[PDB]
Design a protein around this ligand. Sequence first.
Ligand SMILES: NCCN1CCOCC1
Length: 330
Amino acid sequence: STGSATTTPIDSLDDAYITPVQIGTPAQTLNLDFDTGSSDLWVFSSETTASEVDGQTIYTPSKSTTAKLLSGATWSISYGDGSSSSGDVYTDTVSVGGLTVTGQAVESAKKVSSSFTEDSTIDGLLGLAFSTLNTVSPTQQKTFFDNAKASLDSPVFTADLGYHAPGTYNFGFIDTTAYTGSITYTAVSTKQGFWEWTSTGYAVGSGTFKSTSIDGIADTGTTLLYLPATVVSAYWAQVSGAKSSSSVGGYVFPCSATLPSFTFGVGSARIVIPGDYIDFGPISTGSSSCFGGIQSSAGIGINIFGDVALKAAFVVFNGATTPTLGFASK
Ligand SMILES: NCCN1CCOCC1
């Protein structure tokens, strides 16, 4: 079997992407943030504290003839951005772009932090990192991809995010019309539960490529590209007026600038992120300064190839016994 679903930016800056997911019988459609950096499928629900719901569509398991409460199981997650959520666990029929998994763990939120409440467009998350990061306790649950994996024509899923436009998540197949050139694969370490790999270097604009190993994770649930301070400073030094701002939380630059591209290595292959993708957006509508799409990973503890980097590529998350990650230009 296969699945294909369109993912759409939640706003004019691509702060996050939402993909419609059908849960239960009859179908209840929620717009979830597909996150290759986490492993819990959680939703706003009929159990969520009313004061913490502000416009989200909720999952109501009592209206699903296929929902089954997983008694004694709870979940609680904290993300890198300081946000969090927790609740109870059901299993139900979950479909993504025509691909159906029966008995998928659907984590019903009882509590969500203010960051989730303020994003009316995100009804929950669908985790796509390794199932070893799932927070369901005591019984750890599998991701939607892990559960689907056996029934798919091939154990893979692909991310094809758009820049200020819709994109596609496909499960079980490779669309050969979605990229230019070929898909270059690279080794993945599953030791931390992430799609962790090592980039072979970088180039700033038309500069000479610098061969240097950069370990990082392919994370669709992170908005920006977070790389070591050395790389990031070499990039922003090419932009007049660029500087790190403590009040804004990272590199800003005058919105007047047209930015250089940024190339990252995948083995002997090269993925080029256009300058416009790195011009993330103005710090406010009408502001003098714009926020950088490439930021330092120094405070985080891990480099993150987030949406700014991933939207410049067709990305294959190969979930075979020994996982690998593929990148193609587009
Ligand atoms: N609510 C703050 C976090 N979110 C994350 C996703 O995009 C919009 C901002």
